[PDB]
Amino acid sequence: MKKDIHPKYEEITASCSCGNVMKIRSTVGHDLNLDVCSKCHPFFTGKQRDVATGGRVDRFNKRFNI
Amino acid sequence: GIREKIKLVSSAGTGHFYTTTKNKRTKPEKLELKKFDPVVRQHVIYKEAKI
């Protein structure tokens, strides 16, 4: 790479609230803080909970119950 | 029209000169080419000047 023209591409430590510590290299500064990662994000459960929302007949039965 | 003509005069030597056209509106600064003076018999800084 052309030295001088690019910004400073330094190493830094990512540490989310879940506990997954993870060193990476990027133009940020000193340290990092994250919410979610590839692990801990609800996509494997998200698609299970999102798709199984519908159900109109049982909702009627839950009111009447007879 | 528009493009006038100028007299490129030498610096070091006799008052020998060249002549070229020049657009004065687009290029308001002056030329400073390095052309050959045949009286002195050498390449010299030829400055722009008016007729």
């Binding site: 690019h6 990027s26 133009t27 979610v36 994000h41 996509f43 | -």
Partner: protein, 177 residues
């Protein structure tokens, strides 16, 4: 860095069993990632480009190229050799470093996320993503930017069928629909 070593050891060996490749070189490998940012609105304000260039320069490691307009057109009011967008064609070592930083931390930070498009292939294994916000990457400070601007990522491979090229990306634990 780590994903290149992971690819060399774990992924190739996984892809060898799928399509019974005769050689190790037959496996599709990721050639380059081309981050593109057609700012466009630089016609009105000239600095708005230089704002985008700094944001790409922050997002990627390297500095971007200011791409000129190829032809003049009346639809957008642009002419030959006018700076309309910005780009980065990062590859090699910093590419694998960015590719981890994209899929591992940035892609999860996408707003209203669900599952990335499986259909999105060119018919030659070359994938592309379209990020709406710049804020999804952790490089940008929150009180610095002042525009709903984004980029598009464009993963180039040495595949031949999108069918073949899907498995490569799928082997990195890439989120598909």
């Amino acid at each position: 860095a780590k994903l290149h070593d992971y690819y060399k050891d774990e992924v190739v060996k996984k892809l060898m069993t799928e399509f019974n490749y005769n050689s190790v070189m037959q496996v599709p490998r990721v050639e380059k990632i081309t981050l593109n940012m057609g700012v466009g609105e630089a016609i009105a304000d000239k600095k708005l480009l230089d704002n985008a260039a700094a944001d790409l320069a922050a997002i990627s490691g390297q500095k971007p190229l200011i791409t000129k307009a190829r032809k003049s057109v009346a639809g957008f009011k642009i002419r030959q050799g006018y700076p309309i967008g910005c780009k980065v064609t990062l590859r090699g070592e910093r590419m694998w470093e960015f590719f981890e930083r994209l899929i591992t931390i940035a892609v999860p930070r996408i707003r209203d996320f669900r599952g990335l498009s499986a259909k999105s292939f060119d018919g030659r294994g070359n994938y592309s993503m379209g990020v709406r916000e710049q804020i999804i990457f952790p490089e940008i400070d929150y009180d610095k930017v002042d525009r709903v601007r984004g980029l598009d990522i464009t993963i180039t491979t040495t595949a031949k069928s999108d069918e073949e090229g899907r498995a490569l990306l799928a082997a990195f634990d890439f989120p598909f629909r």
